[model samples]
Target chain A: MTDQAFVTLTTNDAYAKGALVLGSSLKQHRTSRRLAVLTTPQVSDTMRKALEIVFDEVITVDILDSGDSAHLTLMKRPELGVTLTKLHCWSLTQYSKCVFMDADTLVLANIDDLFEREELSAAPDPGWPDCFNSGVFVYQPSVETYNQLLHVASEQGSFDGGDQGLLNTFFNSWATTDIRKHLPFIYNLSSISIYSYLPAFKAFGANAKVVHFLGQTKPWNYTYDTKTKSVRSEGHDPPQFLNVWWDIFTTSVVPLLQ
Target chain B: MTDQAFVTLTTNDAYAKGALVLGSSLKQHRTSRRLAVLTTPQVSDTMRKALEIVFDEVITVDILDSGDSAHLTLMKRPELGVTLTKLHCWSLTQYSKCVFMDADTLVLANIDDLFEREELSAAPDPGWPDCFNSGVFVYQPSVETYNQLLHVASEQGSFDGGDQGLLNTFFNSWATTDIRKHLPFIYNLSSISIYSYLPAFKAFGANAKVVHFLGQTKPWNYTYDTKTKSVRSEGHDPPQFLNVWWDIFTTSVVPLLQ
Candidate 1:
């Protein structure tokens, strides 16, 4: 009953890089909860071993393809096809409760207090305020909900064609029911917010607890210089948020990578 | 195919009152699109008649229950347990697209331009940002998607326990896929924002396109003054948002009620 952990999902090698930074960043901020990553068959052995070094546990789960033709054809990484593998987090019933963060997310501070919230706690997505962005959320691991999610996934197949839509549908009342269950936008602030409302981002950016690289361009897209401890983007200077992510990567994750 | 409509739903008399005001508010704003309401067998004939005056169509749809035991037992109004009847919106293929608004929402502008947006366009929920609040969204009517929604609903029963959850799950990618699908928060501003951050609400309140009376206490709970065209809460002066709902109710709706 006491078992709990901070979890992240990475479907392939590209995201494994993000998982590495996520795991180390959690440790850098001194989070007391256990750290784990839920990956899929698509991930390579080398990448899994790399993640195993930084995380308390690196587990593999079955890949659940969305089977949506639009998704199968459109995704940048079509092989992944908007996998529902994240639903596997519900099956980790050994953990009574968990905070599920996306691989693209970097913890900016100690968010142990998040564990205090009940299942389905997550920051609002910058793009859509009502649905808890699937990127990060607090959930209870339950075999019942897990099986039920699989059933729902098979039946409905996620609206956005991924675990996010499935999870949002499963935890539907997050918007209308309890105030405590709703996490603030700061908890999962995406880089999109920085560009959408620069003034608000500038004013509240310092208070962001976690930063999500929600879109395609990610820290992995940049080259990290181990010597200077700086990240280099191709044509333009990296944003401050990316700068912070790289700082954590260089300090906490890069050494582990080496 | 050229037709567009503003739609609302209610299974009972109480919400039917709210729907009347909603329809009239959209009419008062001179929305060029048609206005309609989806009601259940439970709504009284009298209430339906009142709704018909303001709404161009007061269509009846069968209630599709969640059959979720917890939802059935816990809801104050169990007969209206997160019904999937909302999925019928997808069946209205006559209109190329429709904007579905919750009964508690009041339109503040001529949102007919909303039709220009594709299906699944919705403002972010004030409570949960990633999922569009089901209260208001732009969607194309199609028999294929409608059947698909029914299939998903019967299979998954919605994660958060209602239409909002089911719809969010179905339209999962709204957060990351296309920026155009994401509507601004102004389109579906809820009362929660005012209490959660009064200053921010005060600054942006004037710009809200639609005001949603989202929680347990609704506009129908307040007494409306016909002479003053004002709303009075039991113990306190009503907020400015409530005043807007009442002003529209008295001016646009009450006359139709007569």
Candidate 2:
């Protein structure tokens, strides 16, 4: 068991596919650290089993019931239920430190050196650099820190209705405190609209280490012409990153599910 | 007689007015550093005379001089002549280190501590965070560095056809290395489309140290109804920064020009 690990979360069947490909992508680059995935019961057995093949540990957290802190809080505000689940990522003390990547994030290169970063380290969001995009972050897991996050979720909910706002609030000093904690934009290169910002993409897209399929319109949500090996809409040459996602999913992940 | 100063440039009477208010604003904020401006012959003698009253050094660059490095470039790309004049700021080696602020920029608060920062420090552009905006920056002046920059201008002109493009290319390392070089966004707070991205502005606009009248539609280009104390174009709510700019210009600078 490695002391440092890379973690991701998937709460449903739709997201489980993302977890699988993310896991496969990590293995594609051949990372030395362990891979872990946090999942909930809604992930179908077939998909859950597929996850086991890719990850070193598939942690199915059944915390909604008998989890007194979550029970009272979850009952009061059902919206934070998913946020609380994601907060559990900080409870994982088995690994000395962990980098939590969103299930929607795909690894492009082995980023094992991420272990060197301190807790709350992350890339700035493309839309707003002050508040970091929470899709990928280096965090030191602690039961106490996890509970503090739960308290914050119960008390403040979130400004943007997701982990991003809550995490930014918890790590409010991330923007101003230490410049070392600010990861390069390439570590979490968001894929949705930046593709439309082509000159910027053309300038820096080659250095992307992790590509986040970062919107409601993710690769899973789009239709790909399997025969032609293209995402039906190129409007002007489909962003190559999305095509890589489809390439890996079909060649590496779909066969594992079957 | 200090070793450091704030520098700005103006090619004509229209921009000389911006330089006037910019110089006055820096003084109003009570900066200990000296103020300097670069002007071309296109600036009327009256405004040039007024500039000398406001600035410690009103250096009128003779752009038509055959010995100037830009003579060949002006023959090839006449528009770049204005950009070459900006490069002259680097030749002010009398001041060991300097801060170059755009004439279109206005100081909002006393940012004297900016002197503590290293060379090449500047805030990110709102349009793209990767390339630091050229509006306000701390630079170390060297004759060699200035000549190298002039060489780059002659060889490549500028990607965006302005000093902003040419400078960003010369300082390409600003984006990747030494986060200390990355100045806070407030120091060079751009006044443009960010008014539409309001939430971020509401959260941090009050802390702005300088406001850059960034686009071609600068404060001088717009009509301010002086009698009504309002700008004619804001359909809903006026960005108060522009109002403050006009208030200072009319109340303090216009009289100096006349």
Candidate 3:
């Protein structure tokens, strides 16, 4: 492994698609850092091959089941069961530092500069500004931190459940202590739903360097047209940045997967 | 009726909660422009009473149903039926110019300066950078535009089948025309699910003047702790900016609504 890298997780086939698109987008943006993904055994063989094409290494990780039955069931909808599997990013001691991006994120610009940030750097979640949205974050890889996360997950259980809560609680100081650790909203713009300021989005939406599809209706659910180079959501209007994801999917993913 | 106004919409009681928080937040910011809400008769009497406390005018409007059943059904999840109700905002000709903010939006600062923009001023959607999010927009109130939107909604049907699709199509020049019409993303930050650059969010998230809850999970669904002054989502971790909404809610809305 390189000294530093961009890492992601793919627990299953659907998310593997997101991982492929994410890796493809990173390459399209020409990131200088290494790229890798941590996947569970549930990810299919074909999906693993596809992930390998985009990521530097497709490492299989053991699923760390959050034994809390309620939390496990709650995470089931979001494929949260395997979220604990993300702890592997820390054990990736080969990389001195790493930025962990969720499978659902798309990179719009060269974000290699992110390696400069110290560990536990993350954007505040739109839901709770005090808590960082764990979707995209920077951290130094260490076996110690990984063990601590597991210990915390097993002992206290997460506040809101899943990796976000666990990480937020673990990195408790992120809220008020270090202003430098706070990432801008542009970094992790989790698409909440339908409530946004139209004028602001019009003026600054273009400046966004990364886009995260935060909800149930993700870009992968949409159908892409190679002819017109357009994408349409199955039953809804595709998110605006969706075409960017589809462009990556059709242009890069399809070629490699095929 | 006023020369300039900030308008929003509420389709049902659920969204009424959002509208109340929005109006409360706008007032908290001490906006100079008149604040108004467009509602259908279906909104409960109790909800309307609460809306009256914060809104300058809690006016009822006729809902314009997008005749396309398939499209309409798809938009149902996002409460698209009332989305057509947004056309009524254009008929408030008493206001020479208006900024239409989605009920789901929270104003973090005084945005009255938006009146300087021409009609069709809005932030680009985070999903599709080319298209403006309908959540917050600056427009000139006119019966002509209202009729036009209704006409367009019925004739071609929106691509994504909501106000956003309809509005983006109407403002076709937003992508290539004078850049001034494009508002910065700070004005309309739609919170997508994941894929954020933590360092960028750390640097710029504080600068976000407006925050949009863009996906399925909204702020109202969470429980607020008056003691800790914290907000917690029901099942999952709350988004980061949620406290801002709660800060406005407890400080402004609770007093006004109560």
Candidate 4:
């Protein structure tokens, strides 16, 4: 049977805003595949309603370890809480193929073309190109891959100890074995490296397909004062990602009927 | 009736290292109060065994929606997940009074003296002295106080959107209302801010009762290279907190038995 494609994101809600924009943005570009959100039971009532309104399917799944390696790891490392939750994406088998987005990420353009890629195809992490950014990716989910992932983790812990590290260790072949698998850097426009290398970013950034706000500071964590062009800073300028996220968040979610 | 003292902390297992060190450090200095840990179900059998070996009472407690107003606000903001789980400290009414410590903290000296202070007593945060750090604090867990905390949070979302901001907002009068209530900065010494303001830390940190590691990185995330007096580039140097934590974790439970 031909694999079906779907869009999936995991959130308990504060990221619901990000999920909404993700779904709406995909619809705007007109994706033939299904749009889905893999959320937890703890999502806010209002946020859940908001998500249901935007996506075709709002499936409440416990990405938290009911009994899994990630859960086992979490039990041992509570400090990695938020990061561990992101790694729970391995459980999505309902969709033969799926793409995951970080709540802080915004799809500025069509990402559906990514579905054409194989078992594990992801844009290089902006911070470390050798690794894949967990935020945006194309994958074929299966019980076998999930089990293999857990086994790989049991054998070798993530180098960075986050999904980025674990994924790199498992897809050890990504760096050399398959050059065709190397996704364009513009697909996942990470914010962390932007500050470190603006020249390279400025030259290639305009082609960004997915804009990601990585690092300890997330856009939802701060409120923006558009009039002042700043969020937390009293008189200082607002960070660029804040402005970009707001511009996209407030972008009119025009109904498809229109 | 005089309020008895209690000490509480969160240990999800990965933080088991933090939990054991916390218990040992507190015991080493000698505190006359109940000691407990708030843990989720996910922590490992081995780590849980380690925690049980240290804390006077390693209790497994879920973050309850205590009728407290702050908890209700937390319930509303379910997207916060583990963050909300962190705030469940208010449900520890088993002891009339308590002190909550983040698993990342390491105690250098006797902190039992903090119990002498009344409920809601805390040291100033290194980053923002105006606000008290949530890492260490003395409090009386009352349904009323919990409710009021929720009320404060619901009325005004956290400034930083974490427990620290919630506590600061709930106790709006902390800065100016009472000088005695402000525990000295020495109570919550943080390694994170030392680089930024070493002069102040050297001057005041010498007397630190507890040191907290807050930010993108943590102790367990590192490995020690004693020869270097510095952590290795690939996590060669375990952060100071981890070094102290490992020392404390392996020290043994004999002191408790004695």
Candidate 5:
């Protein structure tokens, strides 16, 4: 295939805001490739319309991980099993290569440069510096690669119980064999890492190209106060990144609806 | 005697470096107040002279907490009891008001304004936001208050078995009381909070006036690679703050020694 794209996934309407906001930010920075998102039947038409307006295409995929979750939960690592669905990105064989960002991620710069990276290229996970965070990664779309990931998931069930573990398992040599596949921390900087390794954040947070809002409190969950410039949530400092997400949602995404 | 000063405590030679660097940073910002440090007899003469050059005065206090640690370990919180020596700060009745910063703190601005804050004014703890992190705080030096803390330590001991627990227990109203008494997070931002509340840190880390290295991996523990401008540690983003800490130590604090 000659084309390449940026892709994200959203299972429900609640998460559509992130994909939509994420799409808006990528456009805000004027990305060079097509913006694509994957969703399930559960995402309402209104939410799909919102996604359609922002993303170049919104593909509805069957729930692939929905079958594997019960088996994985019985194996005792149950928290982030939903991430297995991310494997579907590989099925988009029309795109030769793709850059995938989780719906919760906000693009800070024109990340077109990400396309230059090869499969499994990603930044280190804040919790386990040795493994790459699967929240954002560069991959080439191939049906065989999709089948390969499914086979590995069937055999190993993932080490950390998420797509990150499954991915790191399949792309076993990412940490040791190739340095080019090591994406800069700025490309997939975890919001939670703002503490786990703070001095680095203070030194490099300004250069952050993409911020992954990890955990339950995603940006769309917060209320943005334009006058006060505060993100009303169970957190702080001003959550300016979140405000930026809402800024696009309010000014760009919301008006296009109804 | 209306002498207002910044106070820090050091129990050993390793921590003495933190105190000396803190004093250097205070003077770097041209703080109008004096610099005072509490040292134990364990510190050698070589370390003592270095401290005297940076701090306005270095007072040697006896090991008051040595007798308490055995009793405290039984209380099931053994990690931070060395903090009991921090109580020596209140004994400096010569100063009208004092600000006590843990030796690991690096000042980034002219915090002479901290003197305006009342006793018990401190930034909220990163781990438990409701309570203040005693790594840095503003207080008055009174023999009575000094005795009061010892009394509380003797009566119920501390909830967390360290000075933080004792102070938070003694100044129980800090969570719900006067808003002004609650210092902004910038005043005593914990280096560890860089991960705990990243959104706030990303938004306001630039305004941080002080950085408190909370855990065992203090700035001094790292070796600065001046040629490459990287802090060699078990961490990332260049550790610019640790490098900044090391920069002052190598250039300003080291030359004055021997």
Candidate 6:
């Protein structure tokens, strides 16, 4: 096993199809890091097999720890639960550092350079520049940071009732204190701009290096065209990245078998 | 206080603007029964006043107690929530019999004749003949009936997770068992098929006493032309309804002297 930084993603099975594309896109581009997928048991058997075929490690992380009220709250965050589950990456002490990506993200190129940044670093949300987009970011996981996150939660809860709000509130200094902590806007270019600034999007939305569908919509939900960038696929069909991620992830499985 | 039987309509304060139209429409058509509104405490002062102007008894009811969980699950039932939420009419024990109308519905002619139908009775949906539409129904409220409805939920479950499914499932005996329960299709004509059977609708849909926008898209969202007699209003905004609800829901100290 290599000692390089890892790339991780989270899925609740509803977003499993997107997670497949994420793995495949990362593999198609050939990053020299470990690829992992974090999922919950509630994900279907079909989705599990798809992820298994594409990821180096398909790990089950229980956002709901099965305690009492705490566990119930965690499970209730299914829509926002991906963020809570992604925090478990800190327990993967094997990796020197890691970049967490949402299932909704599409990596355009080799983005291994992102690992060089420090923890709690991410691109600003296009909706509100003050908050960091949770779709993509670099970090070195630690037990200390995890506890601190829980601590911050006890003291100051998230504003938007999701990870983006919680993380931004915890890193209260994001607005002006640290420029290095903010990744360039291109890293997490979310697709919810049609309501915010449609004119600007029409002008430059296509040039994004990584697309983050931050709103209720996702790429898997969209119909895509592959030929002349023109063949359209409807919602419910597994997106193109499934094949791409499988191409990258299954390489490890075959080698291990031998 | 005059009651042949109570015909209470609920408007969660969030729906008072609709409640106004609902009550006024019933009054204008001169229903023989007492018209009432069941509202939550959060209902705005303006809406309360507007409701008072129209409804005979604007009684406050707890929304959380109105079987919220079941209602949520029912809303998930596609093309059915509209039908099932209407079924809550069965809980209004104050009235021996009742009829329900969607908040979006506008009544042009007298609808008092609806009370003449037996319990668990409704018109056929415009989309499919086998399935009954939700926009209107007639029923009697009883604890035994509520228990029976709950039993149906526990056993059959809603097809789409909406109230329509629950009602259809509870009234499972409607299709095969009784002929009197089946009302004509024109009672709840949805605007969705404005194009599919336009020629027939131009003749029959024109005589539509009430219109239901069954899908996610709503008529109020679009602008309509005054010149078009085929469809009278356009450019009506959804936010207007939202604002009106907000204005009515605000609690205040009523000036006794004023």
Index of the highest-DockQ prediction: 2
Best-performing candidate as measured by TM-score: 2
Give candidate 6's TM-score. 0.43
- Model-by-model lDDT, in order? 0.73, 0.82, 0.75, 0.64, 0.77, 0.58
RMSD score of candidate 1 (Å): 18.6
Compose the digit string of candidate 3's lDDT tens values, residues A1-258. 367899999888888888999998888888878998998778888898888778898787654445532244334335446656776788888889899999999998888877878988987565334466788999998878877877777767666546886787788876545556656557776665225444435545667878888866778877887787777535646356888888888878887784
lDDT tens digits by residue: candidate 1, A1-258 = 238899888888888888988888888888778888888778888888888888887777654445522232223433324454666677777788899888999888888888889987876654346556778889998878877776666666566656666677778876555656767677888775564434345445688888888765888888877676666655765467777788877766656663
lDDT tens readout by residue for model 2, B38-87: 89888898998999999999887876888875577677768888888888
Clashing pairs for model 5 are A194-B194, A194-B195, A195-B194, A195-B195, A196-B195, A236-B200, A237-B200
* Candidate 6 chain A minimal-lDDT segment of 10 residues: A239-248
Better of 1 and 4 by lDDT: 1
Off by over 4 Å in 1: A1-258, B64-82, B226-229, B236-238
Q: What does the lDDT read for residue B108 in candidate 5?
A: 94
**Of 1 and 4, the candidate ranking higher by TM-score:** 1
Q: Local error of candidate 6 at B227, Å? A: 31
Report residue A138 deviation for candidate 5 (angstroms): 42
TM-score of 3: 0.51
DockQ for each numbered candidate: 0.07, 0.23, 0.03, 0.01, 0.02, 0.01
Residue A165, model 4: Cα distance from true site in angstroms: 45
* C-alpha positional error of residue A253 in candidate 1 after TM-score superposition, expressed in Å: 20
TM-score of chain B of 4: 0.83
Model 2, residue A142: distance off in Å is: 2.0
What DockQ would you assign to candidate 3?
0.03
Q: Compose the digit string of candidate 2's lDDT tens values, residues A147-201.
A: 8888888898777677888898889987667777888778888775363334555
Q: How many angstroms is residue A146 displaced in model 1 relative to the true structure, after the best TM-score fit?
A: 48
Deviation of model 3 at B93, angstroms: 38
TM-score of chain B of each: 0.86, 0.94, 0.88, 0.83, 0.89, 0.71
Which candidate wins on lDDT? 2
DockQ-better candidate, 1 vs 6? 1
Q: Distance from true position, residue A160, model 6, in Å?
A: 1.5
